[PDB]
Amino acid sequence: QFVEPSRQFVKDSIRLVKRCTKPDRKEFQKIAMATAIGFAIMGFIGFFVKLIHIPINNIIV
Amino acid sequence: GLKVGPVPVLVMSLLFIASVFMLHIWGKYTRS
Amino acid sequence: IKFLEVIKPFCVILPEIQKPERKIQFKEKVLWTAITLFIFLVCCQIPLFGIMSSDSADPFYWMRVILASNRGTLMELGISPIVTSGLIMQLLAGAKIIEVGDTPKDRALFNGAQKLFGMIITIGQSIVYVMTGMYGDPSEMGAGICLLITIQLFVAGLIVLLLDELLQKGYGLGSGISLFIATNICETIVWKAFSPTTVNTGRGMEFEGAIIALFHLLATRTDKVRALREAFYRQNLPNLMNLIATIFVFAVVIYFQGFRYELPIRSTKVRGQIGIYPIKLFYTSNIPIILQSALVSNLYVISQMLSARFSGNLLVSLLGTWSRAYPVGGLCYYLSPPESFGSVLEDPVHAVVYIVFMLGSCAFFSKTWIEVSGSSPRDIAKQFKDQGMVINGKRETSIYRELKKIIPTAAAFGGLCIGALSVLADFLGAIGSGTGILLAVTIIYQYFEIFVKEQSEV
């Protein structure tokens, strides 16, 4: 009789999502731009470090 | 224990990087 | 506290970072974070010295991108020892084996035992890497070369511990481990889009970076639609639809990251401090994903080692059969994402089992970590009582009930959502994988929260 606990959990899930505070368009844009800036910074810094270190890795090994 | 600062960590990180680089270069020199 | 006391003589031998005495300015914190990130990124490209052969199969390839690892380099162990030590310390504290304590002496002992366990795990993992066929045959390399490699990995792990501690103590923006994971994942995603590496298999020179490959194909075939479809639908190399799926997954996890329940809280001791207590839908930020990925990778490695040492046994066949080796049957096959949509159609039972396992494991890890990490509704009610905070609409007595009606459901549904996001990213073929993209976006959200906190305070 595990159908009832699962149904109760599902009902709680939709209830919570209904009373969750979804991001707005301005908030979503702010978070998206911040994540894009962070991703660009870290990913491109690592990419340039790897690109620089490829020739030295070839030279030493 | 050995309560040290940030510069004694940055310097040691660069020293370890230089040490492994010198190890590789010395290996290259001694292989030939 | 007895367990910490007996190991205190061993815990007072490893160095620790100086506590800052003036509050560190945001610019100085950014400078320190950048310096530590540059040190880690330089270390993760420098190879070891004693490696004799890096041609053998790699058994830990799976979660290398999220372990901040890179095979054959100084950062080969990555974050594994630090995360393992943190996990075991949290398990000991939550399950009431040791006491973290509200005393600086107790905190010092806790943070010394954590680093001691991290160093022990570093040594053990280095020995395992050496002795399980990596670097070449250990007998051929020799005891001296094995010891030299172990010392190099030992010092690299010490450096990672020192940089992580430097970032934690107040010199940096956040935590070293999260920064390293997110940086490695973002670096992998950027590399699979803008790399200059060229591989030729008969058709000609073709960059394996997706966008550079698109530009090169446009230049070579003069804007031909065949070149466009080769750039988008490239199976053998990273393509552009994988990038589109990656961006879509980032957008969706960003949308679901801002989901939160806003509890209107009033302070009764310091009257007038009305505020809001947010219960994020992603209650346990990425702990369920980390736990599930670690469990699955450990199961894969154990299955490979058992099928190697104990080939022919029925039990190891039930635990998983292999054929980079990929699972074909057994327990480990059902824990692996389906290869493609055709694989889903051929074996719908496997896809259903994989989805069910992902969602259930994520939910279980979330609802267990809320009880082990001290974020259970009872603990939140206890800190509410300690700090005098009360919910506006509800009575002071009905504070634990309101948290019990939200926090367990929030944790469980956050587990389902964060497992479904990983499953969707895996199905869509997104560069970085479900785990990598989820970890990266959650860590960047944490750093964005740090930014909007410190800038607002400034």
Ligand SMILES: C/C=C(\C)C(=O)O[C@@H]1[C@@H](O)[C@@H]2O[C@H]3[C@H](O[C@@H](CCCCC)CCCCCCC(=O)CCC(=O)OC[C@@H](O2)[C@H]1OC(=O)/C=C/c1ccccc1)O[C@H](C)[C@H](OC(C)=O)[C@@H]3O
């Ligand atoms: C983003 C980073 C990740 C995903 C990560 O950090 O994942 C490593 C994982 O990395 C490590 O597995 C090692 C493994 O470590 C072993 C420790 C002893 C070392 C040899 C003597 C694990 C043995 C117990 C496992 C059974 C329980 C299991 O399956 C269940 C999984 C488990 O709790 O595991 C712990 C670590 O287990 C695991 O951290 C975590 O999930 C921590 C999560 C957490 C959550 C909340 C707070 C704080 C922390 O050694 C291998 C050589 C290899 O290491 C490498 C790649 O170099 C394996 O990959």
